[PDB]
Amino acid sequence: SIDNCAVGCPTGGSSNVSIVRHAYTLNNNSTTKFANWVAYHITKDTPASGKTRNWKTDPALNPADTLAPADYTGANAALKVDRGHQAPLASLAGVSDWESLNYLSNITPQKSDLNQGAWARLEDQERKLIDRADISSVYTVTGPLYERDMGKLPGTQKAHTIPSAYWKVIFINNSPAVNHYAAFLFDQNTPKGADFCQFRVTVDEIEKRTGLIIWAGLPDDVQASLKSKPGVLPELMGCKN
Amino acid sequence: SIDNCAVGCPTGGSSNVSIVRHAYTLNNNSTTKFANWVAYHITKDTPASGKTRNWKTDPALNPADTLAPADYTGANAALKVDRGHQAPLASLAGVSDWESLNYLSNITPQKSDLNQGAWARLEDQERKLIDRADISSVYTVTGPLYERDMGKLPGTQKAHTIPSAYWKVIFINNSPAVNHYAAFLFDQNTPKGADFCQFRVTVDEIEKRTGLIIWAGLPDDVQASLKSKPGVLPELMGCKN
Ligand SMILES: [Mg+2]
Ligand SMILES: [Mg+2]
């Protein structure tokens, strides 16, 4: 009865079952130890400011299939990474199970310059959409790419795969079949001062680089036509051209 | 009240009053003798096939400010023009005042190869959008441009100005602030076999060329951002990239 996707959650994730919460729906990867995709639904009632960050192992997963807080010891000193959210805390922290935004199934080792720079500026504009009187929902899917070796967390002996990039696919209101949409993709090494508007892509490119089908309940002809066309939602988020 | 525009009818027309019908809202030009813009609203109840075409002077205008059927005599032979509709007959003739679609305020001398070629193929895809289950409206504004000398109807002594081009701006459902949109512009001499997908433009180009502001009730920030960005509605009409 919780629908975080509206037009069908993504197919193609490594796990056949996904975790469904009020905060998000997530598909875990027991090999990489990170979520393949995280889908969430911002409304006027979901943002909350100032919540704290008590990182915790996700209790719904086997502990061997995800990370624990200990696994991040030394990671910033070794790799210049932060504990980066997939589903964003401030946009969703009013939901009834908000503490799950700080479960490590919703976190990856994200380079600090990306986390605190363009990724954060995109989060801020994504959240600001919901303040518009005619925007009642923002539906987003976000996740990693795994395309080059980014190193290993020094604080764990677990096999894991740090992402090489992160993407976000967004639409407003009811469905990308009728409503504006956007897709963005950022390498881990994105400079801190980068403008997030320079990282617009198509949904098709993200699918091709992930093995996923996003918005998988849309009709075939809608998928074929809109997924290879960059959307115009970024123009409402301050972007030009 | 009949609202054929949803987000504000255009400003900048030469007439300070517009004619409002179920079939369309139009703003006449008493100098050119043709409408500056015609706005219309397709719903599932508006299409009707096979209607007849009794061209008639628009009774709501002064006859000196518009054409009469006699004014078209010899025009096809001399100029290779048709009596081309602005608001399209087959998309709208289910409404109660449908014969007004064949009033000459809704007609211009439009080259036959445009009327019967790319302009008709765009009309067909525009009308087909309303068959999609999630599309409940198509709102369109269309009109002429006057940018070069096109010659004169041979069958009249009235002063008039034949258009050199035609434009069409389309969105679905409630508002281009949240819903897909399109804009197209075609020279009179567009080849008969042209692909209408090759004539996509921005709304800003049409405004700068016409002197109008389309969708004039939108907030300033929405107008600035979307009017310089080509829309993605054409991808649902069969167009690629
Ligand atoms: Mg972050
Ligand atoms: Mg026609």
- What token pair was written down for A28? 């875990």
Write the burial class of residue B159 (CB in 10 Å: 0-12 exposed, 13-18 middle, 19+ buried). Answer: exposed
User: Which ligand is the nearest neighbour of the Cα of A186?
Assistant: 1
> Measured on CA atoms in the order A42, A43, A49, A55, is the torsion positive or negative?
negative
Distance, CA of B233 to CA of B239 (rounded, Å): 9
| Preferred mutation among A170, A171, A229 to probe B, highest tally of B CBs within 10 A | A229
Q: With H, G, I as helix, E, B as strand and everything else as coil, classify residue A129.
A: helix
Q: Which domains, ranges and CATH numbers included, belong to chain B?
A: 1-241 (3.40.570.10)
Q: What contacts A153, CB < 8 A, 6 or more positions away? A: A67, A71, A72, A74, A75, A78, A79, A109, A160, A162
Classify B93 as helix, strand or coil: coil
| Resolution of the PDB structure in angstroms | 1.1
Q: Please count the CA atoms within 13 angstroms of the CA of A154 that sit on its side-chain side.
A: 9
The answer for B6, left when phi > 0, alpha when psi is -120 to 50, beta otherwise, is: left
H or E element that contains A36: strand A35-42
Nearest to B58 by CA among B100, B21, B90: B100
Shortest CA distance from B240: residue in chain A: A225
How far is the alpha carbon of A176 from chain B, nearest alpha carbon, in Å? 9
| β-sheet bridge partners, residue B35 | B28
Q: Would you give the distance in Å from CA B2 to the centre of its chain?
A: 18
Calculate helix-pair angle for A203-210, A220-227, nearest 10 degrees: 100
CA angle, A235 as apex, A220 and A241 as ends, to 5°?
95
CA distance B227 to A44: 27
CB-based contact, A241 to chain B, within 8 Å: yes
Q: Please say whether the beta carbons of B31 and B159 come within 8 A.
A: yes
Where would I find the H helices in chain B? 75-79, 89-92, 112-115, 118-128, 203-210, 220-227
Q: Is A117 helix (H, G, I), strand (E, B) or coil?
A: coil
DSSP assignment of B179-224: B-EEEEEEETT--TT--GGGGB--HHHHHHHHT-BSSTTS-HHHHH
Task: Output the six-digit token pair for A193.
Answer: 């001062």
